[PDB]
Amino acid sequence: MNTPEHMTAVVQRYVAALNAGDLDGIVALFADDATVENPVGSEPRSGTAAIREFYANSLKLPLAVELTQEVRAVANEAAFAFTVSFEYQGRKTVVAPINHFRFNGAGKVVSMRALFGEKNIHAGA
Amino acid sequence: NTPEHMTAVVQRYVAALNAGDLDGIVALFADDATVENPVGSEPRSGTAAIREFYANSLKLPLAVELTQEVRAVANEAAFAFTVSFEYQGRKTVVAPINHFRFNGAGKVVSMRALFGEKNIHAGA
Ligand SMILES: C[C@]12CCC(=O)C=C1CC[C@@H]1[C@@H]2CC[C@]2(C)C(=O)CC[C@@H]12
Ligand SMILES: C[C@]12CCCC=C1CC[C@@H]1[C@@H]2CC[C@]2(C)C(=O)CC[C@@H]12
């Protein structure tokens, strides 16, 4: 089933799910033995339980998430630029990563990696 | 590798494509680096092949421009950009996202360029 059209749709779904705080729908996009490496450089989380815990932890504050450019999708991989916004104690932060998804034949994500650093975290005092 | 180093290297890449400075591009890479253009394709490997690649890439003048901030962390960077060229009166703009991994010496050990057909923007 995996096509560039499918992978683009999955990226759009992943954004929508984060927006909604929908753990079931985020985790559903992943293969059972997938990895999540967030940020790049950290120990990968491996398999459904670990992936759900990771997203649960990321979702404790409501996130407003938005693609900021066209999805790049080719072969069996996709990359996307987006922002994740949240508020805590009256301060708004906007984080701007680039994520990479690798997909299996069935169109499930087998690996996510998220590149961002301190310069991509935008907050006032 | 500081994020500032890796960000600067990305800007150097962009500047050297703009300037058609083939030395300038190839110098960013490790001895034994790979370039995958597009992501799904067999990589060019080693200095000679990487140079050949970029020589072919510079047959037409290119206009290249970062379209967002660089993301750099650990020993890796990713960047959203455009590269435009003009051929027989038509302009094409390709909008990839590229990934570089850097070695301890701060040289690029791999590039991948992720763009698909929907990232190639051209009229008639
Ligand atoms: C995990 C995450 C969402 C899922 C995704 O795809 C990419 C990211 C990267 C930035 C994370 C964010 C979740 C909320 C985080 C932890 C913050 O409060 C600061 C950094 C930010
Ligand atoms: C300019 C380029 C080679 C010549 C013909 C067509 C091309 C399209 C996409 C370009 C490629 C050169 C290298 C490039 C700028 C990347 O680093 C990503 C997109 C590539």
SS3 annotation, A18-59: HHHCCHHHHHCCEEEEEEEECCCCCCCEECHHHHHHHHHHHC
Q: Residue B74: which CATH number? A: 3.10.450.50
Exposed, middle or buried, A24 (CB in 10 Å: 0-12/13-18/19+)?
A: exposed
Distance of residue B66 Cα from the nearest chain A Cα, in angstroms: 13
CB B62 within 8 A of CB B17: yes
Q: Which residues pair with B72 in a beta bridge?
A: B77
- The beta-carbon neighbor of B114 closest among A39, A41, A79 is A79
Q: Pick from B114, B120, B17, B10: which is nearest to B59 by CA?
A: B17
DSSP A119: G
Contacts of A88 (CB under 8 A, 6+ apart): A61
Q: How far apart are CA B94 and CA B117, in angstroms?
A: 9
Residues in chain A: 125
State which residues form the domain around A97.
1-125
> Is the Cβ pair B117, A41 closer than 8 Å?
no
In chain A, the N- to C-terminal Cα span, in Å, equals 47
Question: Residues of A near B (CB-CB distance < 8 A)?
Answer: 4, 8, 39-41, 68-81, 96-98, 100, 115-120
The values of phi and psi at residue A76, to 5°, are -120, 30
CB A112 within 8 A of CB A99: yes
* Number of domains present in the structure of chain B: 1
In the structure encoding, which two tokens stand for residue A43, read together? 């120990």
Chain A residues inside the 8 Å CB shell of B68: 68-69, 81, 96
Atom 11 of ligand 2: nearest residue by CA position: B57
Convert A88-108 to b/e letters by CB count within 10 Å (16 or more is b). eeeeeeebbbbbbbbbeeebb
